[PDB]
Ligand binder design. Structure first.
Ligand code: HDE
Ligand code: HDE
Ligand code: HDD
Ligand SMILES: [S]
Ligand SMILES: [S]
Ligand SMILES: [S]
Lengths: 726, 726, 308, 83
């Protein structure tokens, strides 16, 4: 019952392109990739090769195939302690999933700053460009359970645990720069409204249902993040190709005591890229693990996810200078008003070893700050500070969750806390209280100061009465949705319209749809009309007369809010499907793979069955998957080389493959006789922008294809796709 | 600095007698003591000197005296994460206590066999006299909570975790050879009956209440262990001075596959010794921690608890050779029939560092056996096998309780179990199932064999129908209680009578006392009538004529059942109270302490206040405690040296000290004018056995006293004590 | 039938002095003592007389004396679900005890105001002398575990849950008018200092040890409550004979929104009385359940604890 | 015990029998039923031994296992009949 003689069960411990080898635990795939945190886990990493199988008490097992019974057809005996331990451990494997962001995918990596930031913050991890800080990052959706699908329409979470020399800092952000609501007290109302409805627990992974649109219609403060969610920002192509934001105004505190307001950003160095809805939705069924898989395989390939940390910085004296409140988390700060300053780079370069132990049990919380950082009175942030420590008590089984290996600081920690369930640390301190004389008061308080100091809160002035009241400055709900809307390209706007139209069409109570359209009329009449038309709703005269909200501090638009308006394509790490026939022209394939390899673009070789095919020159080509097994949803572009095209010309799956890729705006390249497929997608002889064609696959042919892929999708094709039945 | 300039806050890191230094964590008290298990806990030991006080996330705290508030008289702010982390950990410090044996005290040590036992067992830890096995031993009561008193009347637990090279072996025993009930299905009934009654949760740490004696009167199988409990066995002097027993027949299995029946024994090398009831009960008030204290201080002094492991061995073909069933856990195996064969020595030589982490969290379970041992069909043991795994899932929070440091095997452990709450080990195996080819099937099963082989159960024959039935062979309840009774000395018998008499006086419903007397009449008429008289009950003529039960395989007594029939006194580690006066005779004191030192007996110098007094010759004598502070209950003998006896002669506390000690049968020694105290305890001028007296404290004065301490108590004094008002 | 012919196993359901009858669950001792909260608990009370013994799933048990085994001297079978359910429930009976005040004794009663307080508070339970509010009160020590002794020297807790028509109000007090410490941030320090020390877990129910006095000597804010604990306040004769205090300044608020500062008091109508130290300490050995017993029996006897 | 937080999962309303249930089991996390029985053990005299075991019978009887014959050695072995 053993490994094959040829050793093909075991993946090479070298970088390999997606699909070339089975995937593996990080420490086995990439044993030479290290950082301080990864090394500190060595105490708890457990191997397996050459070891005897045992109980958890260290007793060797002789027969792991059978229960102990009285005769070989008899009843199982209660003295079988081996059976009961095994079954007991299995019976208790599951722990509660996260209340939100239950679905998530994580990796290890490192961060370093570009230059010292000591003029604006005394945070040790930002103090030296050569101080390297280990990170563990988890990306997530929001609404769905841990076994829901990745490519849903939803906000995405982007949480970073920085293991700094002065403690853990968790930057717990999302992929849009705002949230749906203003005050933490409403968080359970909002989350309950977006989650599956309580009678029947439907729908999973979807805001497209009555309760969510009911809440939105009744709480116009939600409209800004709903605009983001209905745009293609809601359906990213990859965790590598979305932005991150810290959601609130926080403070930086420098050694002199100066406070600067800051908002945090992550810029994807692979560029901004999203799916289209039909693709995204169909992909939740063809591969509900697509983003998890893609993240893992990118890292195994050496296409390490890289992100640039950036800060929007506002001096304390400028708090009131905008037409929105800095502490309102439904408001963004336009980069045209306050530019993002580049701060440093984060590289994710190793996968975990065990998903449960490292991902599922990781606890991130935005209250985990360090000296040099501080909070503000953002009333959403304020409430978050209570929740992320509280929730761990049931999720991770008690207050010793910092001792779970993934959560442990690499910085020293010593204090007078004791006991709690599954206490690991054995304290030797004679004292468990301070002040004490019996241990000469160790461990001791440390004064604040420029570096290695104790934490002190910035002495912000507070003046006001004890009130449950929303600040009047928070009472404006339409100008930021409108700024976002006007900043999108015409195709992005169309996709926003289609997102609202699709979602409200699944709301069963029609008055809810009407009320949401009325809200849309307060943002932009063009948007409101286009949604209304799809829902068979007619705007009233009064609605047609609603005055649009004011510009945001004079802005008519801010192109940094669009995914696509300013080119930022990076093809490295993208993937092409290559549709084989049973006699591929090897000259075409040679040139195709050469050009792809030169830009770091991967290929998957697809056929109508598995196994191998032989090219015209005898080259044997292993088949990664069938046309149906790896649909065009999973790739960025499709190439069909020349050869025995008759072999696949009438294959329904091969034809469909191209109709689907065409519909979803992906570049297609057809060489030699593969040009016969132009008929399936109705391309005129003259050709079409977005379809690359020539007698063979050459320099020019690949250059054109790769240029298209740098632009992500072929937006000009959109008018031509209504008609395709796919 | 808060520590005193003279360093008097820090206990000397060397062996010191009780009271000489404050007690300390083990690793600080005795840093040079080691064994394989203590070494392996180093990775979780946390120090404190010279470290900064931090959060659990490693963030330094500047002010650990105040919450964060808006103004120094203002409200506490939700953003104070340092306060909430500290208070959250505190709020969740407690875990469920053990269902039974909640009260207990534990120490590290080591075990070594005297010779290889490979002819009778393949257990690795018994294979080589050079093989040294680390242990962790917890002693306990049974009924009371973790916060109940030590010197209650109750059974005691004696549990030993052996960290062997072939797995953990837990020997989970008690301090009597049998149990109260026959089948594990009744364990919740009997435990509910002894435990505090469910309406009002009274009484703590006591079987002296109606529900206990109701159950016993209705379940005569209980009477054997009840006899043990009512004897002075139920109130041991120390955990160092009681026997241990494994309770059941288990099996040894040798390399040839031969099974031998075995019962386990621990023999205390300090000898057998118990309190008397009045002393034990008062001591639960004066020092409810006395046995926990005595154990910790013995180890700190170098009076390491030592026990000899012993086996009663019965060949398989001898299963039915006795008057009782070997599988009946209410039956003992008399040493007169089957001798205890000596096996090895165990020494407890290090205290824990943190009581919660090491003691409270330790999990012992008798199903934890190793190759070379196996179970039998004892139907109480059979049900134990289920409980001790199950109970851990609530008590220790889940199925990874073997990853809590004290519970970890030192032997290797590898298998395919994954996840659960508090998962520490990060498994790198590509497989989490077997058989697998993707990891060449590792970790792998191991065939049984003479050494380092997999566990295989002994192939015992089973034959019968599926029944809920007690074996008829278990239906005899009186012969063992009778054997035990007849094996006791006349003074041990009197204490048994008084134990029943006192307990049944606290049963409110008179018919329950009557029913128990009826049971005693089935065991022994003398015993029954003597109880009856104390309760004002008269035996009927039918009761007077009940035939006594048969002897046990010809035996009319077995002196190994008596605590005192056969002297096994050892004075090392006992303690003497020395009653000071303001002008002590130094020549007496010098001679007292010299003789006590030579035999390893400790002393405490007591007076009417703290501080010092000065001897006749200027020597400054430090006072340990006041007469009231350290009552006679806590020592084994009392010595009063000569001098200014007038100083203390009319001190009520000093006179009462001698009265209490006299009542409790302790040796008393009076030198010179301290002979004046003879009037307070009514001693005749010619003296009496058990009272040492002379003009001065030597020649043979200390030898006489030490001879009396070797015999533990002055049993001959019993008739004199009823006259003394104490 | 196992009960005695003469029926002497069953306590009379009438008030009786201490020791005259066996004590009993309160709904069997005093079936006709009612209040709104006692009545509302009827849905969960379970009786026993005349019912068949069953599993928790409602299956009647024939033999509650034995496990199922292959032969009457054979091995116990894994299919014995009756045995396992019974042992499973047993194996999981315990829950964590309270971090502090683990030792405590409780009773049901009622509260009624002497006059309307609407001039100073809109609290509904204080709005009319006719407003009867059920209460459940728990008295406690502070330091010891749930199985520690009653007559230790310690602060006592006095916690009252008022089941009002406008919500639960809990008045969570102690038997002295102040506390040891000023700021909550130090509570784990002070509690760790008074609790059994961490290396060896000694001593139980006692402040008489190095770490408590170490903290006190370093934190003079403690000295006021320390004086109270060292006085005979720290060893009450009975929960019926001690005072209660709300510890903090709270506020009353009236219908006009006017705030008045308030501190709360409970005045024992049985008067104030404490033990002496020697007696209290010895009592922890002779009857560690003394105060729990004395409260239960006072109620059984009609000596109802009353406090103003 | 982990999924539903302890041994009182039968008191979670959907899981409750509609048949009567009474026994001597007590406590556990989330305990809802308040037992008034003076006894929490059997055999007991203080509550005249209630609730009481019930003999097997044709209807409303106690559970008794079928007395199937068992015969063999204690083995971890698959029956050859299963291969
Ligand atoms: C700006 C990014 C953001 C915002 C605005 C919020 N979440 Fe998150 N969340 C928890 C509670 C919580 C509250 C009370 C609020 C506003 C009042 C937010 N969220 C908004 C939580 C219950 O504490 C949570 C669930 C499980 C857990 O451990 O914490 C939680 C999760 C969460 C994650 C997942 C972190 C991870 O484990 O990967 C992220 C990225 C967010 N929140 C972002 C976030
Ligand atoms: C023979 C020595 C002995 C015997 C015969 C029994 N106990 Fe013990 N016990 C548990 C259950 C249990 C059952 C089901 C039976 C007979 C059916 C016995 N006991 C008799 C337990 C409830 O599972 C227990 C509670 C905590 C735990 O982990 O297991 C348990 C405790 C216990 C200890 C304490 C070990 C320690 O932590 O110090 C000891 C020495 C015994 N039992 C001995 C024992
Ligand atoms: C900051 C933490 C903290 C602080 C400063 C205090 N308490 Fe407390 N108290 C707790 C935290 C706590 C607790 C940990 O939350 C407990 C134990 C578990 C429980 O349910 O609450 C509790 C229990 C508890 C009880 C027992 C309730 C019961 O019987 O079930 C009483 C009577 C008090 N407290 C009273 C006081 C008094 C009079 C205080 C000072 C005037 C005080 N507490 C300060
Ligand atoms: S946010
Ligand atoms: S036993
Ligand atoms: S207080």
């Amino acid at each position: 019952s053993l490994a094959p003689e040829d050793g093909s069960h075991r993946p090479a411990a070298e970088p390999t392109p997606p699909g070339a080898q089975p995937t593996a635990p990080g420490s086995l795939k990439a044993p030479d990739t290290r950082n301080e945190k990864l090394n500190s886990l060595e105490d708890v990493r457990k191997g397996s090769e050459n070891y005897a199988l045992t109980t958890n008490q260290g007793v060797r097992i002789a027969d792991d195939q059978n229960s102990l019974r009285a005769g070989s057809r008899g009843p199982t005996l209660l003295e079988d302690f081996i059976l009961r331990e095994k079954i007991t451990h299995f019976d208790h494997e599951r722990i509660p999933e996260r209340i939100v962001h239950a679905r998530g995918s994580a990796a290890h990596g490192y961060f370093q700053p570009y230059k010292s930031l000591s003029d604006i913050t005394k945070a040790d991890f930002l103090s030296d460009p050569n101080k390297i800080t280990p990170v563990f990052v988890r990306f997530s959706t929001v609404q769905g359970g841990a076994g829901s699908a990745d490519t849903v329409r939803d906000i995405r979470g982007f949480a970073t645990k920085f293991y700094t020399e002065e403690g853990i800092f968790d930057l717990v952000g999302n992929n849009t720069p705002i949230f749906f609501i203003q005050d933490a007290h409403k968080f359970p109302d909002f989350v309950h409204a977006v989650k599956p409805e309580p009678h029947w627990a439907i729908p999973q992974g979807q805001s497209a249902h009555d309760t969510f649109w009911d809440y939105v219609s009744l709480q116009p403060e939600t409209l800004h993040n709903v605009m983001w969610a209905m745009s293609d920002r809601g359906i990213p192509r990859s965790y590598r190709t979305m932005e991150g934001f810290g959601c609130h105004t926080f403070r930086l505190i420098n050694a002199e005591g100066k406070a600067t307001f800051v908002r945090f950003h992550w810029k994807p160095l692979a560029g901004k890229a999203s799916l289209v809805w039909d693709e995204a939705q169909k992909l939740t069924g063809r591969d509900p693990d697509f983003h998890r898989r893609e993240l893992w395989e990118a890292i195994e390939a050496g296409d390490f996810p890289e992100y640039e940390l950036g800060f929007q910085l506002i001096p304390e004296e400028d708090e009131f200078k905008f037409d929105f409140d800095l502490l309102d988390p439904t408001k963004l700060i336009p980069e045209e008003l306050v530019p993002v300053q580049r701060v440093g780079k984060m590289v994710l370069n190793r996968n975990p070893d065990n998903f449960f132990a490292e991902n599922e049990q990781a606890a991130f919380h935005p209250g985990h700050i360090v000296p040099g950082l501080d909070f503000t009175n953002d009333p959403l942030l304020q409430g978050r500070l209570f929740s992320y420590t509280d929730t761990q008590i049931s999720r991770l089984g008690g207050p010793n969750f910092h001792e779970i290996p993934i959560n442990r600081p690499t910085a020293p920690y010593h204090n007078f806390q004791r006991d709690g369930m599954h206490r690991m640390g054995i304290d030797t301190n004679p004292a468990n209280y301070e002040p004490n004389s019996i241990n000469d008061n160790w461990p001791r308080e440390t004064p604040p100061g420029p570096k290695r100091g104790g934490f002190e809160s910035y002495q912000e002035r507070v003046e006001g009465n004890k009130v449950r009241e929303r600040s009047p400055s928070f009472g404006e709900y339409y100008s930021h949705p409108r700024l976002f809307w006007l900043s999108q390209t015409p195709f992005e706007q169309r996709h926003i319209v289609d997102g609202f139209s699709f979602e409200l069409s699944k709301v069963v109570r029609p008055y809810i749809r009407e009320r949401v359209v009325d809200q849309l009329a307060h943002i932009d009449l063009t948007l409101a009309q286009a949604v209304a038309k799809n829902l068979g709703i007619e705007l009233t005269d009064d609605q047609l007369n609603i005055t649009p909200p004011p510009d945001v501090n004079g802005l008519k638009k801010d192109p940094s809010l669009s995914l696509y308006a300013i080119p930022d394509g990076d093809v490295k790490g993208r993937v092409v499907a290559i549709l084989l026939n049973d006699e591929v022209r090897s000259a075409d394939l040679l040139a195709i793979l050469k050009a792809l390899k030169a830009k770091g673009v991967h290929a998957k070789l697809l056929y109508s069955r598995m196994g191998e095919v032989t090219a015209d020159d005898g080259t044997v080509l292993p088949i990664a998957a069938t046309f149906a097994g790896a649909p065009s949803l999973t790739v960025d572009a499709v190439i069909v080389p020349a050869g025995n095209i008759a072999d696949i010309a009438d294959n329904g799956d091969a034809n469909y493959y191209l109709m689907e890729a065409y519909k979803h705006l992906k570049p297609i390249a057809l060489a030699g006789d593969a040009r016969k497929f132009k008929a399936t997608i109705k391309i005129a002889d003259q050709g079409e922008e977005g379809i690359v064609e020539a007698d063979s696959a050459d320099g020019s042919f690949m250059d054109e294809l790769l240029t298209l892929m740098a632009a992500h999708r072929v937006w000009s094709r959109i008018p031509k796709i209504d008609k395709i039945p796919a």
